[PDB]
């Protein structure tokens, strides 16, 4: 998967 937004890190 690709880098998620910071609220899903």
């Amino acid at each position: 998967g690709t880098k998620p937004p910071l609220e899903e890190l």
């Epitope: 998967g1 690709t2 937004p5």
Partner: antibody, heavy 118, light 111 residues
């Protein structure tokens, strides 16, 4: 009431340029993850581009087939985003939807038509 | 990542259940622990509308007649007690990777 309303589409000639717009109300725009998604008889639904939260510094990404020709942009103060499309081709023809939310693809506008031509 | 959605057409009687599959060409399980598989419904003349996100979470407004399950590469949307207003095209979608959609399943009401 969340609302997403697309405007700006229509006919353009192959090789031409067009900008489409999305206007929103009913939510904190700066918190929302936004996408453009298009639909056509061939290909069906394809993701086109995205632009992330203010918290994520409005980071942007594009589908492979539009990378370099499309530019997605937003203005949180106006609850608006837009998609600038250059070197349009027949295969870019379709219904373009503005979509977003805190949940992502939570809400979808009615869409706007982009027809490339001759 | 390929989302293969099945069947193309799904005739079902009112009150019956319908079941829709989509399978992915690779795991939809993100390294962060979440599975980003979503279901939409596009009624005639309307835009797609989100039903379920992350496999099984009904979005606000969506009745629990609609339920998603599955894991990894194999997912299912179930609609119990189908009503005519349920008709239209269902799509699955994944955004674990660069976002992609299934081909759609048309729910048709038996008459």
């Amino acid at each position: 009431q969340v609302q997403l309303q697309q405007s700006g589409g229509g006919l353009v000639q192959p090789g031409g340029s067009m900008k489409i717009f999305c206007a929103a109300s009913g939510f904190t725009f700066s918190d929302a993850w936004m996408d453009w998604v298009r639909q056509s008889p061939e290909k069906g639904l394809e993701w086109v581009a995205e632009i992330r939260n203010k918290a994520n510094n409005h980071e942007t990404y594009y589908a492979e087939s539009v990378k370099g020709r499309f530019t997605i942009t937003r203005d949180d103060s106006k609850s608006r985003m837009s998609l600038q499309m250059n070197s349009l081709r027949a295969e870019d023809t379709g219904i373009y939807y503005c979509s977003g939310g805190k949940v992502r693809n939570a809400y979808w506008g009615q869409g706007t038509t982009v027809t490339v031509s001759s | 990542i390929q989302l293969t959605q099945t069947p193309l057409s799904l005739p079902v009687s009112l009150g019956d259940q319908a079941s829709i599959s989509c399978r992915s060409s690779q795991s939809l399980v993100h390294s962060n622990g979440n599975t980003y598989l979503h279901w939409y419904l596009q009624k005639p003349g309307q835009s797609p509308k989100l039903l379920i996100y992350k496999v099984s979470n009904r979005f606000s407004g969506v009745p629990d007649r609609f339920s998603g399950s599955g894991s990894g590469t194999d997912f299912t949307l179930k609609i119990s007690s189908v009503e005519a207003e349920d008709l239209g095209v269902y799509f699955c979608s994944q955004s674990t990777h660069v976002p992609t959609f299934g081909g759609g399943t048309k729910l048709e009401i038996k008459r």
